[PDB]
Each structure stands twice: as C-alpha cells, then as structure tokens.
Amino acid sequence: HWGYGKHNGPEHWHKDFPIAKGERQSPVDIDTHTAKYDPSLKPLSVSYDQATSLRILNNGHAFNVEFDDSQDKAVLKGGPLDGTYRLIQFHFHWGSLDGQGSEHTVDKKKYAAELHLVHWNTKYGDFGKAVQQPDGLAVLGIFLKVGSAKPGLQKVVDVLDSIKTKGKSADFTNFDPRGLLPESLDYWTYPGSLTTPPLLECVTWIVLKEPISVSSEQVLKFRKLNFNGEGEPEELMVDNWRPAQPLKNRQIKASFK
Ligand SMILES: NS(=O)(=O)c1nnc(NC(=O)Cc2cccs2)s1
Ligand SMILES: [Zn+2]
Numbered sequence: 001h002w003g004y005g006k007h008n009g010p011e012h013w014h015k016d017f018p019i020a021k022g023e024r025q026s027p028v029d030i031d032t033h034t035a036k037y038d039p040s041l042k043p044l045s046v047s048y049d050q051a052t053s054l055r056i057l058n059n060g061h062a063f064n065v066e067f068d069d070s071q072d073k074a075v076l077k078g079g080p081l082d083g084t085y086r087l088i089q090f091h092f093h094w095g096s097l098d099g100q101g102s103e104h105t106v107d108k109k110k111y112a113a114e115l116h117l118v119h120w121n122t123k124y125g126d127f128g129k130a131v132q133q134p135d136g137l138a139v140l141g142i143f144l145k146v147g148s149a150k151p152g153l154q155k156v157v158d159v160l161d162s163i164k165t166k167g168k169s170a171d172f173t174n175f176d177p178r179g180l181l182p183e184s185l186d187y188w189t190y191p192g193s194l195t196t197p198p199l200l201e202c203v204t205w206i207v208l209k210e211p212i213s214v215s216s217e218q219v220l221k222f223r224k225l226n227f228n229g230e231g232e233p234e235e236l237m238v239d240n241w242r243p244a245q246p247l248k249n250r251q252i253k254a255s256f257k
Contacts, residue, residue, distance in 0.1 A: 002197050003061065003227065005235075010242045017197045024201045025245040026192030027103035030252055035188055038253040044185045044206065045078035046140075046178075051087060053175040056159055060166035060227055061196060062091040062240055065156065065175060069120070069127070074177065076119045076138050079206055079255065080189045085119035085138040088127055090177060092116070093195075094222045096238035098146045101219075103195050103241045104207050106143075111211060112219055113144035114241070115180060116195075131194070136202040142182065142212060149215035152179020157221045166229040182210035186256040195242045209256065 002008050002016060014020035051074035056065045066089045067074060074087035094113035095101025102111035117140040120130035130136035144150075155175055162170045186209040193201045225237035 004240050013197060013199065017199045019193070019199050019201065022193070022199070022201055023248055024191050024193055024250060025199065026195050026203060026205060027105070027242060027244055028190065028192065028247050028250075028252070029105045029108055029244040030188050030207065032107050032254075035252040035254045037257050038255070041080060041189070041253060041255045042078045044076070044187060044255075046076055046181065046185065048074045048087070048176070048178045050074060051175075051177055053172050053177075055169050056156070056163055056172040057169040058163040058166055058225060058237075060229070062093065062237070063160070063163060063225065064089045064091045065172055065177075072122070076117075076140060076206075079187065080204060080253070081138055081206075082135070084122045086122055087117060087119050087177070090115060090117045090180070092144070092222065093241040094144075094219060094238065095241065096223065096236075098216070098219070100239070101241055102143055103243075104141055104143070104205075105244055111143040112146045113214070113222070115142040115144060115212075116140070117142070117177065117180075131198075131200050131202045133202055134191070135204060137194075138204045138206060141205060141207040142180065143208070144214050144219070145211045146216050146219055147213035149218055150180070150212050152176070153214055153218055157218050160221055160225060164224070164230075165226045165232075168230070180212065182208060182212050184208070184210045186210065186254075188252050188254050190250050190252045192250075
C-alpha cells in the first residue's frame with residue numbers, strides 16, 4: 001500500500017491513483033513574486049470558539065485530531081470561499097530534520113512541518129460527498145518553524161505517547177484549535193487537491209503567510225511516532241510530506257501586498 005518509503009512513496013502513487021499527474025495537484029511551490037495580490041479577496045473568517053474535538057488517531061501516515069462536524073461549531077468562511085466550511089480534522093506533515101517537512105514551499109523554502117486544518121463545504125451535506133466536488137474542501141495550511149514553543153500545541157504533543165503506532169486512538173476532548181493559529185491571517189490561495197491518496201482535486205487551499213514557531217522538543221516528539229502497527233517492525237513516522245507538484249494552469253492569489 002502507499003506510503004512515504006522508497007518503494008511506496010510519492011513517485012509511485014500515480015500507479016494506483018492516476019490523478020497524481022492531474023491538472024490541479026497539491027502541494028505546490030508558492031513563488032511570492034509571481035503570486036498576484038487580489039484586492040477583491042475578503043478577510044478570512046475563522047470561527048473556532050465552539051469547536052468540539054473528539055479524539056486523536058494514528059492512521060499510519062500522520063495523526064488526526066477529529067472534531068464533531070454534525071453542526072456549525074467550528075467553521076471557515078470568507079477569504080476566497082463561498083458559503084460555510086466545517087472543520088472535521090487537523091493533522092501535520094513533518095520532516096526527519098528541521099530543514100524539511102512542509103508540503104507547500106515558499107520560494108522553494110521548506111519549513112520544518114505544516115499543519116492542515118481540513119474543512120468541508122456544508123452545501124454537500126457530508127465530507128464523503130464534498131470530496132467528490134471541485135469546491136468541496138477548504139484546507140487551511142500553516143507552516144511550522146523551529147524556535148520558541150507553541151503553548152497551544154503542547155496538549156497534542158503530550159498525548160502522542162498514547163498513540164505511538166498505527167491504529168491507536170485516544171480520547172481528545174476540549175482541545176482549542178485557536179491555539180495553533182499565528183497572529184496574522186494573511187494568506188495565499190489556489191485550487192488544488194488532497195496531498196495524500198486518493199489525491200482528489202476538491203480543495204481550495206488557503207496557506208497562511210505567517211508561520212507558527214514550535215520548539216525543538218515539540219517536533220522531536222512528532223518524530224517518535226511510528227508508521228507501523230504495534231508488533232510490527234518499528235519505522236519512525238518522519239518525512240510524511242509530498243513534494244511540490246507542477247503548478248500547470250493555475251494562478252496563486254495573495255490576500256496581501
Ligand atoms: N493532506 S490533506 O489535508 O490534503 C488531506 N489528505 N487526505 C485527507 N483525507 C481526509 O481528511 C479524510 C478524513 C476526514 C476526517 C477524518 S479523516 S486530508
Ligand atoms: Zn495534510
């Protein structure tokens with residue numbers, strides 16, 4: 001099955017998922033000088049005050065913190081979006097070294113990790129229907145650099161020992177995702193895809209300009225997770241990022257000058 005190793009990594013995905021070579025694949029390199037300011041772009045509206053987190057799961061590729069999305073509790077609106085997108089889960093991609101780990105790059109620069117807050121368009125009724133639509137998802141992407149600790153990330157870091165291996169889950173209630181956001185909501189936006197199989201071209205990507213800083217100890221704990229299940233040979237969950245894909249016929253728009 002697919003993964004991030006030598007024999008099943010991103011260069012192999014197209015064999016099971018031919019859309020891997022499609023017209024709107026993600027991630028991409030964000031060339032900041034080529035991105036065009038669009039003064040018609042609205043400010044982002046992030047309303048996470050009523051967010052209800054449920055649990056955290058190691059899925060063998062990353063870990064997902066999942067939310068109750070059966071009501072408008074945590075929603076993303078505005079920006080390039082029409083309508084309301086409901087938060088369903090967040091996860092990260094990270095490196096084996098601080099010099100790599102992000103999926104999007106900025107003028108070819110790689111960050112240590114990248115946070116993805118995944119939202120689905122409520123007009124499609126549920127996530128499964130939404131991913132079949134070109135405007136089905138909105139993923140808010142936030143870069144992580146190594147520096148000062150992010151206090152709002154610590155509760156995530158501390159539960160990771162309980163989900164070390166593939167298939168392990170733990171209760172994860174009352175987590176506030178607002179503690180993962182940077183100060184500024186200036187963003188770049190472009191139409192793209194899921195960055196893991198099935199690689200569906202259903203995502204409006206909104207990537208924040210300002211990274212958050214996390215500590216060396218915090219990202220070190222991400223790297224102690226396992227791709228494998230318990231009782232299988234240990235393989236550290238690191239470098240679970242897809243590299244930049246061709247931009248093709250797309251324009252990246254910026255919300256800021
Ligand atoms: N890296 S990414 O954000 O582009 C993604 N790639 N695949 C994804 N699949 C899902 O979010 C399905 C799930 C919904 C709720 C729990 S899992 S997100
Ligand atoms: Zn992701």
